[PDB]
Amino acid sequence: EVQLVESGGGVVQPGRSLRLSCAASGFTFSSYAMHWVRQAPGKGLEWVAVLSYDGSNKYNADSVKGRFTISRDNSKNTLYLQMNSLRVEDTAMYYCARDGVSVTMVRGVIGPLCDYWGQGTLVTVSSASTKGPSVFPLAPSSTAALGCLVKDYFPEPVTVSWNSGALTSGVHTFPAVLQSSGLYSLSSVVTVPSSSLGTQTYICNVNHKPSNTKVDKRVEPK
Amino acid sequence: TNLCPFGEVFNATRFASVYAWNRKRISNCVADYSVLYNSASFSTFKCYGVSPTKLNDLCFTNVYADSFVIRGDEVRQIAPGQTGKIADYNYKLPDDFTGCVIAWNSNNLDSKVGGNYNYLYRLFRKSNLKPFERDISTEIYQAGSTPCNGVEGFNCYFPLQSYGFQPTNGVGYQPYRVVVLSFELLHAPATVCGPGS
Amino acid sequence: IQMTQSPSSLSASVGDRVTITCQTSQDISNYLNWYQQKPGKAPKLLIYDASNLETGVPSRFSGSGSGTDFTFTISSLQPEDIATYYCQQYDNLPLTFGGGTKVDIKRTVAAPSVFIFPPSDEQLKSGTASVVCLLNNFYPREAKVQWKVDNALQSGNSQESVTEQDSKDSTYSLSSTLTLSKADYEKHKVYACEVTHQGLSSPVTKSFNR
Ligand SMILES: *[C@@H]1O[C@H](CO)[C@@H](O[C@@H]2O[C@H](CO)[C@@H](O)[C@H](O)[C@H]2NC(C)=O)[C@H](O)[C@H]1NC(C)=O
Numbered sequence: 001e002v003q004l005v006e007s008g009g010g011v012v013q014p015g016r017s018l019r020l021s022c023a024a025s026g027f028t029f030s031s032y033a034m035h036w037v038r039q040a041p042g043k044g045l046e047w048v049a050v051l052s053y054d055g056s057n058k059y060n061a062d063s064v065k066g067r068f069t070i071s072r073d074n075s076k077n078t079l080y081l082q083m084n085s086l087r088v089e090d091t092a093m094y095y096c097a098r099d100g101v102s103v104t105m106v107r108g109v110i111g112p113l114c115d116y117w118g119q120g121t122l123v124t125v126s127s128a129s130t131k132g133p134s135v136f137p138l139a140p141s142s143t144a145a146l147g148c149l150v151k152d153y154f155p156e157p158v159t160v161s162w163n164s165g166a167l168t169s170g171v172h173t174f175p176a177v178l179q180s181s182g183l184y185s186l187s188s189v190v191t192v193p194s195s196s197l198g199t200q201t202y203i204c205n206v207n208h209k210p211s212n213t214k215v216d217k218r219v220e221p222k
Numbered sequence: 223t224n225l226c227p228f229g230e231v232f233n234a235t236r237f238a239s240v241y242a243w244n245r246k247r248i249s250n251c252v253a254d255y256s257v258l259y260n261s262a263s264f265s266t267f268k269c270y271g272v273s274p275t276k277l278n279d280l281c282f283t284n285v286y287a288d289s290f291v292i293r294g295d296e297v298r299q300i301a302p303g304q305t306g307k308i309a310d311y312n313y314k315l316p317d318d319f320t321g322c323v324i325a326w327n328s329n330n331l332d333s334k335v336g337g338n339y340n341y342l343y344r345l346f347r348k349s350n351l352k353p354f355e356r357d358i359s360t361e362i363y364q365a366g367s368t369p370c371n372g373v374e375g376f377n378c379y380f381p382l383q384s385y386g387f388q389p390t391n392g393v394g395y396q397p398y399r400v401v402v403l404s405f406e407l408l409h410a411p412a413t414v415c416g417p418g419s
Numbered sequence: 420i421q422m423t424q425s426p427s428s429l430s431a432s433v434g435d436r437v438t439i440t441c442q443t444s445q446d447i448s449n450y451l452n453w454y455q456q457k458p459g460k461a462p463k464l465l466i467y468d469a470s471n472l473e474t475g476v477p478s479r480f481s482g483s484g485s486g487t488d489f490t491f492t493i494s495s496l497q498p499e500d501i502a503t504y505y506c507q508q509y510d511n512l513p514l515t516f517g518g519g520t521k522v523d524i525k526r527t528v529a530a531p532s533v534f535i536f537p538p539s540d541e542q543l544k545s546g547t548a549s550v551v552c553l554l555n556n557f558y559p560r561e562a563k564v565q566w567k568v569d570n571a572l573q574s575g576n577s578q579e580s581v582t583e584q585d586s587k588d589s590t591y592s593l594s595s596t597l598t599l600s601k602a603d604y605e606k607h608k609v610y611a612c613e614v615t616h617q618g619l620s621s622p623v624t625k626s627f628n629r
Pocket residue numbers: 228229232233234257260261262263569570609
């Protein structure tokens with residue numbers, strides 16, 4: 001159907017520049033207005049800026065007026081968001097969405113506004129380097145519990161799967177916690193019966209794209 | 223519901239010396255004295271003034287936990303009405319004492335080979351201590367009838383002698399960690415109560 | 420610029436009728452919008468300009484648009500419906516959202532099963548000791564965990580993460596991570612984590628030695 005796929009956000013120190021890409025597909029793009037709104041980790045939504053149907057009407061929000069500019073290439077069906085003078089506070093996942101109700105913006109009222117279709121978590125990390133995790137076992141001792149310990153990894157987007165992801169029943173992947181050292185900390189656990197603690201072998205597959213690290217760690221009892 | 227922080231009393235990694243014995247006031251909590259006497263770890267356990275059975279049933283207005291360290295031979299002086307170097311210059315238990323004294327051996331945690339001389343004890347004083355009187359004075363005491371202007375000399379000594387705690391000593395001279403629970407009962411509502419009262 | 424209000428933190432059994440009222444700020448707003456945001460996914464426009472839901476929604480939702488105050492009605496609550504619900508105004512261009520409403524479907528009370536984990540010897544080579552305590556498949560999330568090292572509470576040494584409510588069994592799951600070093604791990608001997616949950620009479624203490 002219609003999909004506002006995004007790519008272009010990453011990790012960049014404060015003070016620099018980085019432009020975002022929102023890609024339009026399906027519907028006519030030069031006919032609809034486009035918005036940019038962001039959501040911090042654990043917080044709620046926050047409006048950023050907007051652009052008309054290329055009618056030269058930006059109307060950015062505060063704290064970004066002069067720091068962000070909205071650009072669209074309606075012949076390319078692609079919408080962008082040039083960032084610059086990175087306030088470190090701007091660490092958030094940005095969503096671009098359509099609009100057909102605005103007043104001085106897009107000509108004529110067509111459809112609703114803010115059919116989100118968003119993605120592309122944008123993190124404005126401090127100078128601290130992008131660090132890979134250190135996976136540790138959470139071996140059991142005697143349903144029986146069994147997990148792995150993802151510790152000391154600065155970029156947040158880490159994933160985990162147990163034994164080639166064919167074991168997906170009884171698995172609990174937890175959100176990360178921010179340690180005092182500026183690094184995250186995650187744990188992923190699976191509860192299995194004691195009758196399979198000696199028969200089937202359990203391995204956690206931790207994957208971390210920003211650090212380019214993947215560690216297959218066994219979990220053996222004490 | 224919040225229990226009394228007894229775990230912050232016995233297991234504490236660092237204990238003070240006896241001349242400077244530490245005190246942690248215990249109030250507004252729930253006593254669980256069953257943890258104390260349901261254990262074979264405590265060497266000397268002598269309750270003074272209190273029942274040997276009503277331990278978990280009582281209710282005192284306040285409780286004082288006096289914890290310090292002495293060697294193996296000096297625990298006999300942690301008792302109401304005693305005479306001795308600790309029982310005269312470091313820790314004086316009144317004759318009407320109403321509480322339980324807990325002692326256990328710690329020759330492995332407070333001793334080390336080569337020496338662990340951090341612990342001290344008051345060796346000299348020109349008067350016996352009064353009950354609960356903490357004395358940490360650091361003046362050069364005079365023994366004989368010949369004055370001392372602070373010079374560490376023949377009869378002028380520093381009043382705090384170090385404890386030599388090595389694993390290869392006699393039992394009498396090994397570190398025993400002591401906790402003295404003092405049950406204060408004043409004309410006031412009680413704050414430290416048991417679980418079965 | 421408005422500060423849109425909303426009563427969050429809802430809890431209702433499966434198949435009920437709940438409502439959220441977003442009352443606007445100064446300069447009465449016309450035609451708010453209603454979105455839903457399930458965890459890990461981008462929001463989705465549920466309702467149009469104060470009414471007239473879109474195509475695709477299961478038609479269990481509604482709302483009424485009258486000047487300053489608004490309402491968001493959900494009939495026939497669903498197990499696959501736990502999310503966060505926002506209200507957005509658009510009549511002055513600085514669009515401001517609501518507070519969001521976390522939704523928890525009321526299920527039969529679940530007692531927690533608690534498992535403890537010592538730090539791995541591999542981690543001890545890094546000079547750190549991370550002890551982990553698990554709470555898994557309990558529906559009432561208002562549970563507490565207190566680490567008792569040698570029966571002494573350790574304040575400011577633990578962080579716990581609570582999973583989103585499950586879809587099949589509708590039970591929560593949290594995990595606290597007590598963090599120490601090799602030095603203060605080597606002077607203590609017993610590590611435990613006491614547990615108190617709405618479906619527990621007496622506290623649950625899972626302990627281990629080193
Ligand atoms: C540290 O405090 C705890 C609780 O007051 C004591 O640990 C107990 O040890 C006994 C004997 O092994 C056990 O039977 C109990 O189950 C333990 N309780 C707990 C909660 O750990 C211990 O006695 C104290 N340590 C010292 C130094 O006295």
